[model samples]
Target: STGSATTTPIDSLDDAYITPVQIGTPAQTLNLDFDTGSSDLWVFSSETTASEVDGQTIYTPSKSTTAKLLSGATWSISYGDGSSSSGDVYTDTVSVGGLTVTGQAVESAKKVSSSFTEDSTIDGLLGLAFSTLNTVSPTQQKTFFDNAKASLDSPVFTADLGYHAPGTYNFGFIDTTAYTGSITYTAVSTKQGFWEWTSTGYAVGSGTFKSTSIDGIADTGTTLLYLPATVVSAYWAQVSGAKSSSSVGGYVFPCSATLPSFTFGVGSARIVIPGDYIDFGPISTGSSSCFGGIQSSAGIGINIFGDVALKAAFVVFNGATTPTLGFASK
Candidate 1:
């Protein structure tokens, strides 16, 4: 059976960033962003040029008595979207929610762009998700989870995005009280930190789509729900009175009829995403047409279940213990 729609609750520490609960003292606060695309915690400093920084809240390391710079090491990172940042390495005391984690790995970006410098809200990204896609290390790096695994209440971390609001992201120990039963466990892949799975098939309004089968990774860095082309076409066919139009170089449909519920199968586990989320945005091509949550990723080889799909399930990333992923009901 498909799980009921339940929203996770999270408290926003506005303009506040996360640091290792053991490093920074209560007196000095470091603002950080929690990013899933990569695994690294970094911040900007006073040495950074005005043009070198953009949307980030720069942390003044020199002003803090506990901050320390790692000499002889330089760092630079370029994202998949072509944005890049360069900086120096440092080890410093970082704090979050009054939890001071000491000797934490930190990056101080010397060069940044409008996207990173202009934002006054967050100083840097505190990558707490999977470790496979990390861009920070010369050698692949393990993020906060790798460092604090032994000390945490659980060897796992839970991302409660959309808990506070639609775009809000939160991280910490999984709240066992939120689950109705035990989580399903999946073994981690050797390639990177991504959790891989195979699709048995898809179901719509209790009707199974026969020709749709695929394998892919679930990523939090992405925002849209991506599926294989055959899966996309078959699902679109199931929508009542569905007609396609071009928008974002893909097929979008319009149907006012009672939309059927869809479920993606992973082994015996089935994840159902409702019609409301499917018809989230207006399709640019056909007037009054709405876009489906599932979009075609023909050239893109991997299927990513973004926030829209993740919000429906309780995901636990276990970097410690068995190094596996666990999913349960919220």
Candidate 2:
């Protein structure tokens, strides 16, 4: 069951890739954040209390004749960045583009933390990660991608992450027209429910490639690229007036400072992130200080190659046996 969807950037924040999806039998549409980092098809629902609900849209499960609540089941999720949400469970038909998966587990949020409620653009999360990462209790759940894979021509998907532009996510198919050059592939290890890969090394703009091993995940849910503290410090050191700020919670610099491009190696393929993208806009409201898009992982176990890094290339999350990540210029 091949399908495709368009993803658009959100205003005010250089953040996520939001895509439209249909849930339940009647096909209630919701704009979901297609996240590769976690596994849970969750949504803001009528089950969410009135006081808890904010500006976000709600998914009313009762209105769909095919929606069935899973008795005694629950789910809760917490992120490293302090965002979280939790709720009860239901089994329903979920469709993206024209691809449909029957009896997909849908988490209906009964309680949403401020981190989630404050985001008005995304109504839910369509997790694309491995199904083993699913948070449902009493029984595990498979993600929409997993349930639909057996019917696909190939268990593969591609992400075209664009900066200040539109992107597309292809399911069970890869569009050769979407990218340029031979797709350089690197083996991915997914024991941690992430698209984790190791880079041969990296370099700051115009600098010699530092030969070493660096491991990180391709996380669409995260906003910035996170690396080791040593690398983070090395990159920021070259920027005049750049320093780690407690107030900003990351390295900040004068908005006028010229930033350097960052290049990380996946075998022989060098993926370069532009200098301008490194400057992740202003660090605070009404401030001239801009935050560095690449920062130290803040004690998280692994680093994250967030949108800032992923947007620089056309990426394929190959899901067949011996999963690999294919990269190419957009």
Candidate 3:
């Protein structure tokens, strides 16, 4: 079976995206972050610390007759941004778009990071990454996508992220109308449990395309594109008022600066990101300085092609035995 769901950006800066999902017997719907960087389907729940529960919806397993506790199972996850959550587990029916998966492991958060509490738009996170990254102890569980793969017409899903408007996530099939030109396919190394791939190179604005192997992961959860220090500096250097701010923690420039476009290679294909996307947003509310969407990933250990980059093209997360990634301009 195939299903398609609409994903909306949570903020004007396209900080994160949220998709509606149904869970449990009576079908309680919640807006979840379809994150490709993590592998744990966790939610705010009745069991969550009351102090941590803000305005977001919580999944009450007691309301669902089909929900069953996964005895002795527990989970804990810490993200690259230092946010974290820990919880117990339950198996329940979960539906994404219209695709249903029975006995899906649903992690119920007992504790959550402070940052999550401040974000009132998302109720939880639905991990789309490989199941191997699942944090469940004693018995690791498969991700929603992994569980639904068998019944899907094809073992693949596509991410069509938008700049400021709503996007779409399609399962089991690819929409030919969504993208222009032929897709550039490349091998994916799932060894690290991520949609990891190597790009041929990149170019700063209309400059020459640097011919080198740049490895990175496509993470929809992350808000910014992170590359090597040298590559990031090269792009920022072109902007007259840009500076790597020590207090700001990244490269920031005058909001009036003419930001240049960014381009990355996928095999022989080159996808260009318009300047507006890189402008990100004001460093502070109504501030004259703005943060560059593309930042240096020097201390992060791995380069990440996050929402800023993903929004420039259509992405296919092929989950076949020998997984691969396909990229195309949209």
Candidate 4:
């Protein structure tokens, strides 16, 4: 079995991508963020307080005949950005695109942080990382990907995230036409519950490719690319007028500055991110100062190659017994 779905950037800055998901009998469609950085298929639901509802859609378990409460099963997750959500669990039939999973764990959020409540674009988050990352207590539940992988023709999924546009997420098989070159495959570590990989080297713009190993995770949930201060500083140093601003919390520069491209190696192949993509956007509406898409990960503790980096190439998250990652240029 195979499935395909179109994911669109919810905001102008491509801060996050959302895809339509169907849950329970009669199908209540909710636009969900397919996050590869975490594990938990949680949603805003009837159990959530009306004050936290805002304008987002809610998933009502009572409306679905197939929904069953997983008594005593509770879950809570906290993100690096300080946003969080927690709730009890329910099992129901869930479908994404054409793929379907029976008795899928649908976490119903009773409480969500102010940030989540303020963001009206995302109804919930569908975790595509590893099942080991699930926060459910007593009996940890498998992710939608894990449950559906066995039925797929191939135990793999591909993410083709676009810049300021729509992209496709495919399960089971790779679309040969989606990429331009042969894919470069590398070993991945799921020990941390993330799609972590080590790149062979890096180069700033047309500069010499430095052969230094860089360990990072491919996180679709995150909005920017975070690297070690050494690498991040080196890249920003090449841009005129770019400086680390404590007030703004990251590297920022004039909107008119000429930004350099970023390149990273996977095995023998290299993926180049255009300079325009790294410009991010203005620090605020009508502001001349622009926040960089690439930032130092010193405070973050982990180097995250998020959407800013992922959108530059075609990525395959292979879910075999021994997982691997594949990357190719678009």
Against the true structure, candidate 2 reaches a TM-score of 0.97
lDDT of 1 at 144: 64
| TM-score rank order | 3, 4, 2, 1
Q: Specify the poorest-scoring 10-residue window by lDDT in model 2.
A: 9-18
Candidate 4: which pairs clash? none
Query: Which regions of candidate 2 fall more than 4 Å away from where they truly are?
Result: none
Better of 2 and 4 by TM-score: 4
Tens digits of lDDT, candidate 2, 24-77: 878889899988899999999998867777788888999999999999999999
TM-score of 1: 0.75
Model 1, 1-330: lDDT tens per residue?
001112222223111223322234324444555555566676777768776665544566776677776666666776543556777776776554433456666777788766665555556666665666555545555576566566655565665445225332223466667666777776656365565555666776678655345566655545556887777777778776665455445656664645666676655677676666566545554556666666777666667766556655666666664566666655
Q: Model 3, residue 280: displacement in angstroms? A: 2.0
Order of all candidates by lDDT, from best down to worst? Answer: 3, 4, 2, 1
Candidate 4 structure quality by residue, lDDT tens digits, 134-236: 9999899999999999999999999999999999999999999999979999999998999999998899999999988999999999999999999999999
Better of 1 and 2 by lDDT: 2
Q: Which is the better candidate, 1 or 3, if ranked by lDDT?
A: 3
- lDDT (0 to 1) per candidate: 0.58, 0.88, 0.95, 0.95
